[PDB]
Assembly symmetry: D2
Homo-oligomer: 498 residues x 4
Amino acid sequence: VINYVEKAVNKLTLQMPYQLFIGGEFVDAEGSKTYNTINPTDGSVICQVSLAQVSDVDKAVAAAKEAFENGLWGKINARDRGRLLYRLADVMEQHQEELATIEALDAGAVYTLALKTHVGMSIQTFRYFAGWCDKIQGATIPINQARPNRNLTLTKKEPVGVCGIVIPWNYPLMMLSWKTAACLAAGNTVVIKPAQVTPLTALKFAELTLKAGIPKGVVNILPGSGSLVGQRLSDHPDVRKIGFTGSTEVGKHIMKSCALSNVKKVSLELGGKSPLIIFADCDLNKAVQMGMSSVFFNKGENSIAAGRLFVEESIHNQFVQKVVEEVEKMKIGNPLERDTNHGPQNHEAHLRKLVEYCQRGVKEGATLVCGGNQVPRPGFFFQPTVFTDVEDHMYIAKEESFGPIMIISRFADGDVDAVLSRANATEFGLASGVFTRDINKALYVSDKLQAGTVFINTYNKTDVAAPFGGFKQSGFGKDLGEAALNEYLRIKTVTFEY
Amino acid sequence: VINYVEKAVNKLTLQMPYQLFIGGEFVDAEGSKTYNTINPTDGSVICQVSLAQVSDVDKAVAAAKEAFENGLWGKINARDRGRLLYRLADVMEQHQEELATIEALDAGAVYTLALKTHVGMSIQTFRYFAGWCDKIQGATIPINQARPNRNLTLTKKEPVGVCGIVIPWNYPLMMLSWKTAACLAAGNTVVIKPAQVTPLTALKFAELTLKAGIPKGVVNILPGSGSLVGQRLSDHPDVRKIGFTGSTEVGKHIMKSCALSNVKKVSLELGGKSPLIIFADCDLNKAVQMGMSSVFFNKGENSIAAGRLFVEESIHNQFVQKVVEEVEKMKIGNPLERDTNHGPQNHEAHLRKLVEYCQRGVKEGATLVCGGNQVPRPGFFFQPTVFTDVEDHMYIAKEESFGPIMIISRFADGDVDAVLSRANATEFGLASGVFTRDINKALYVSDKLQAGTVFINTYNKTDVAAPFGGFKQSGFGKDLGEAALNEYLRIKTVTFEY
Amino acid sequence: VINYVEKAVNKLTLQMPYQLFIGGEFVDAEGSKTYNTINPTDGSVICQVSLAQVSDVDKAVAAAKEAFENGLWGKINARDRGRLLYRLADVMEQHQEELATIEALDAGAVYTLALKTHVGMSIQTFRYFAGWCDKIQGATIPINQARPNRNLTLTKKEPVGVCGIVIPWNYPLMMLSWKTAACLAAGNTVVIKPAQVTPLTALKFAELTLKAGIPKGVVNILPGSGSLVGQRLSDHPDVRKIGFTGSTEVGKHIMKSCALSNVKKVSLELGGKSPLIIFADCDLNKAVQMGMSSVFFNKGENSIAAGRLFVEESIHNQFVQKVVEEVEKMKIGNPLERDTNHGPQNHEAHLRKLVEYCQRGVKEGATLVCGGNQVPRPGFFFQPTVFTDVEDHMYIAKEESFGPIMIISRFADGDVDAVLSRANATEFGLASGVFTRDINKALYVSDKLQAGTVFINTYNKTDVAAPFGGFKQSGFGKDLGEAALNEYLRIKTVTFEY
Amino acid sequence: VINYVEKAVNKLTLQMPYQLFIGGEFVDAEGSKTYNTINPTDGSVICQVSLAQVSDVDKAVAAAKEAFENGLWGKINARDRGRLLYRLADVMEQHQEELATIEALDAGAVYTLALKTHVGMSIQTFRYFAGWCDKIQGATIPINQARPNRNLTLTKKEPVGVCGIVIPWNYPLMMLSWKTAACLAAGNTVVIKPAQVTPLTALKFAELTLKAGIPKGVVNILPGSGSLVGQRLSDHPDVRKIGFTGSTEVGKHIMKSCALSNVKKVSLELGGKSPLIIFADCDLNKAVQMGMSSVFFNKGENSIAAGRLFVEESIHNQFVQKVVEEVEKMKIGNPLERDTNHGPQNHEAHLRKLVEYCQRGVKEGATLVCGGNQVPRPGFFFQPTVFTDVEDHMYIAKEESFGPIMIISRFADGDVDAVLSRANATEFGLASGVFTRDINKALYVSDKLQAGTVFINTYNKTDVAAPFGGFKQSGFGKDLGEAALNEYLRIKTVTFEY
Ligand SMILES: NC(=O)c1ccc[n+]([C@@H]2O[C@H](COP(=O)([O-])OP(=O)(O)OC[C@H]3O[C@@H](n4cnc5c(N)ncnc54)[C@H](OP(=O)(O)O)[C@@H]3O)[C@@H](O)[C@H]2O)c1
């Protein structure tokens, strides 16, 4: 019998676990410590949640180790592991309205979007990776033969073993799912640390693993702080791999911690300052629509968001006029209301950071065309913002906002290489985009952009089958696609002589 | 016009460059600083070698950056990149005797072995990877369609950019070749730091890249210390990937340095304590030959060396008798002499370390059945060594000797899981082996061994097509095989809407 | 409303469609023609089934064409096609007892086996290939660049289009499923011709595609004769690919008909005379069990059945003795009786062939140890048969029986190459096996056997992920595995200059 | 010593073998039968060439079989097989001027073009496939486990064995090289039948295999007729695969012959009627240059030649004007003159077919804008020809000319599906192209074209790494690229229980 925080909202009765999930059971943290999770629509406390301690991490890791080494997960057919993950996906789909509602409460995710993305994509992620289980294959290799004898060389793909997954707050369930689906399809067991400010969909997901029949200890979830819980995961002698999504600065620290303990494997999905180049020969109205999506999607809490838009001189003013027209039509409001287009930012500290960000933008001399401020209403809403006359030396040209702030520079008519160079002049390299009807420009620009993803005449078009990851200080390794599997597998080479 | 140290030896004339190699030219280090490289056959000084300084590292990195960004290497077809690397392999082949002689002098490599392995496998490496250049391929992916529009998603495999390669001294030319061939085949440029005590074949190799037509700046070589030169490579903001082979402790430090600067990619080939399990049902005579080889190959200076032999009780004593019989037959002496089959250890410090290692084995109660001492002759020769009665708790059961020291334990007849468990009780996981005529035991044991390579009825059987790399604290990433390319490539996802 | 033949049997009420399945509905053939399907347990008529005519083939092909070119199947995401196929597997699972019972009635499949294999593997097949839909990927290739311009080359994996599948009667549903699953997963539409003698599970499967939501016209099923319906499929100008399983001589004719019409693609899964080589050093009791299975599985109605057993002289007589003891324990009976382990042969004409086969065996000088005859009881049962003293020149050493007939020869102790040569002296090359505890012998024999599948210390171990197909006159192309998809895809190369 | 036809021409003394090449020897045909090969520049007899008889085919096949089964080729490492093929490419490169001259004489290949394409791409093909030999890899597959036991399933990629290669006359050396390089790289041995009219580079190539150290019998070359020699190859019981390139009608007969004998594998590269669609928004002067190349390249003797050009209404007349202007500038003449743009047609009967083809185009109502007749001069020259007002029902709109004949239709501005439908209304499907600056048109058109290759803003851009093959009646299977290997390898599945 599981304890729940019951809540009647959105024409449903929510049943929300709030405890640590260790070894297949929900339990209090050491000393029954708890913390509050805050609803960004009104600032209220949703409920209290267990606050994991070092000793709780050790319990979770030991559970994950036991489940891997002796438990059923390490013994079943790859095909049957997939069946379990495809059942987990079905269970998530049967509970999708509920999960989207929890996500709306916990993270401020507009409910209609959370059904399609926060939850919908999480469901696709498990189904997609479930199909990979019995299709992960090694090789047989035509090695030189030790004549007069013979040789056979094969490789085996094996799990890495116990993994730690540490994620941010922008899409709590989806970031969990991206990494967990891959981790599990490869046959690993896991300890997951959601962002402290957003534990709820992770904990409801935990309960769903029980309904799906995922063996005890395969999935362990520890709400709590990075510096305590996350840190211990990265130092742990029995953890063999860390999957991390977050800031560059925490990413550096995680990699260092992987190094100093046991050279556990690490992959890093870090920040972005993604450029979007819009040429005069694009479809203008479409550029306005995708341009807006590139910045404002999920209230800008989107690591691949276009962090700079470069717009060709001859269409720049008209582009800005049209963006403003469209911005005025966005309906800011409660994420649970069906007419809402723009929900609140995820938490208070981040709202304050966006306010400071835009003050500094104005100070340094950029033109504030609209927004820039907290919306006058309860909770942590921020007004969709547009800046123009942004010059390359400005702080807002360099720094990741992670909010709904469109940052626009001009480039001269016909000036392709010059704008590319401005677009690449950053230590980030997560995403990028180009709008043009011209095939030669589109191909050339996409060769030249120094980013892990290039969108052409679209934006935010990720997919569970398309690998996603950065270059430079945006990190390394992929989430999604076949390529994601390689972060969660080891290759054993076996060489016979006969 | 290049400066050489010239030496008539082994029926040829060695012409050995001795300077740093930067931007296609041989140049003195900052301040014309130099150091001595020492011949382990007689302890003599071979010659003076330039000692790279921080500013030399910066020059080398800048030459590599320019070669990659604006030089010809970043412009030619992948096919033509292949041609250049196939030509470099040819040029190495034309100088095979000279290279192997330099290696005998510099590392004490027995000449006949250096020809086949140190040099022969290096030539194979470049030819293998040259063949990969126009066969490195991305994907097209059946992503969900934004109906009524269409989407196309492809990936492009691109180079990482400037890489640094840091390598040890046991196989100077071969370690360099393993990593450099994969690095260059993937379209990168590189700065290489040979182990300070073994710079000579790296510099000769550098000259050979000129003969081959490799554009200036693509290969740069900096003889110098790990703590100055290697450190700066791992710290440099323009270096994007480090390929490292060496000890676990230095590996941790390299990985930490990569994190703290610019989250440059890293791969790590670290130490081993590889177990070899010998069953009573094996071909015993052949087990003695392969068992001796698993320890003594290349005077034990070999990361995959069997650092522990577990011999089934009923054949143990007979196995020992025969090894002792064969050890007595080994000709220890000058690596250039054709009857030599055991050359000197690589350098004085390491010989000392081996004497100390064997003292500790004796002190702790292991039975020294032969060897254990420096051979009383000039240079740094150490006796082929056999320990028996080795207990799991003993130092020599756990620490990597990196020398010709056979370390033998018994296990009970019919035990399989118990010996596996003892063989797995290490934080190393580089290689391993099993001798048995029994198919079921062979397949089962290779499943259970926690190591990146498992040899069955052979040992030391690496191959340029077979991926090579560790689990646990032996590191991560592969050298050799298709898999090695992945350390040297980035994946860019390109998604169109149309 | 669908018309059914209703039947109360096996504690179920069977609802069996009996008409042509065309464009998503059950319809009568041209002129309402029908034929009888016969129950092999007692020779009775199960029911009347529509008898497809030429005009019915054309209607089916037209419905497949329309569903491919204009219907929903041609438009949905690969991922959603996957979902439809997974759902189809679920529906099959919900009907598994009914499908196994229908197969028991129609093909004489022993019910408990049909549940596990005939039906159970069919379900696995659809789930497996459902997983492939969104993981079928093309390439991007590093072609030479037309400088100063650039080139991009990619490949797209596309459906072949309208396919015909023609299958035999030994595993009616499973042979349908193997090929149909791969065909549909690749995005094609299909016209299926079951063996005329075994139409029933195919017709039920057709109804299940409706339950699962497969768009109309994607699956069309045509009970009828090979010489009429099969022939027209292979001749049809709008069919682009034939997938065929059956005899070598019909295979040859199908291939010829593909040629003479529109060079439609073809794959051919033909007969087998598969050798099983049993060495003295094998586990003898397991060799008996697996040897039993290799011949008698599914009443020998199994294309990969061992059609010759080669037993090493020193264990030959002992092996035969043990086999006879085991054969005597087999319960022959009605496939619905839970204690039955040997059911009747599929249909009468095949029983007749088996009788003639053994007459000729005895005529030519082989020693008939047991069986060889129809069991005296109603239906078409055949007594499990063992021949010894079989010589290489004998008809029964050459020709496929496709019935429960063990055909044993000796080979001299210590021989390997001689027995290999005898095992390879056949124009067949479908499967093969070796039992030995010796690793070197097992690897060597598996190299030298000229067969598409080699079993080692097991037999009949097929798997939906393991490719299955023949060499030489056993055909070409694979069913099962990733490799099966290649028969049902085309590759388009797209090369840009920009 | 080998007998040569000796000829002082093009600054060289050509030494041309003229006999059959069987088992590493140049030998006369049965009864010393010969025929004449004709120089198409002046109609003169170059020399007499042996005319292979059936018994000669049988000797070639026996030599290939023996080379495969017991000779060195079947025993050497894959890597060493690669070396021999690289060395063969080196030898071809050292004889490249000589080979190009021979091709100029035998096929009318313009010398400068022959250096770059006929010969140059042949050299690239051998180098490319040489790199594949040690990178052909099988798989290890995570099959369901027969609990309590374990299973290992692996695949081995194996050669098919003795192959027959039958080719046409348009690029005699290159067609040979495309197929043979892939054939040999996969480890097979081969009998090659060159087009009767063009034996000479094939025979010179044979001698080059000797110089390169390709083991006797691996390559056998039999000049002679398709209906005698080609027939017997396709009928032969020891040939296991035919690789065919030629007409659709012969392809059908070849496929039939493979069926009727021993179901040998077959791949088919058949004809083309390839559409090129040129939109008004293309770069027009470039479209004229590439449009001309698309038809006139290699005097139109090019399977992928654009057999119809669809030109958008608003640019049609200007396009035709420019074409005519550029056509008038083409230098027609002796393929040895360095300024020749247009050589003679390959042989007399083909010239006559081209004269008839143009008669018929005028007769049925097409507008002859220029050319259409034999150039009056010695040899077999045909005028570069342009037709306009071509309509979809016309003979010249459906039939492959295989000559320098531009066949132009208009299509209405702003229709796309309508032009596609016209471009797809053929049973051919070898190649196609689209010229447009619009990315959306380019991508959509490339999806919709029913052709194995789509060129975008280029034409004739084949590459040794890019797979090349038809859909529909243009055949199946690929030459070039990784995908070519699959026609020449078999897959053996090996499954263990342990
Ligand atoms: N897995 C494999 O493929 C493999 C192969 C060969 C060897 N090994 C391992 O190598 C070890 C023995 O070699 P070793 O004792 O020379 O190893 P090491 O001390 O770790 O040195 C390896 C290389 O790293 C350099 N280095 C030292 N400090 C550095 C720093 N702070 N930053 C960057 N580079 C630095 C060294 O420079 P210096 O020359 O100045 O010392 C040397 O070039 C054994 O454990 C052996 O198993 C592993």
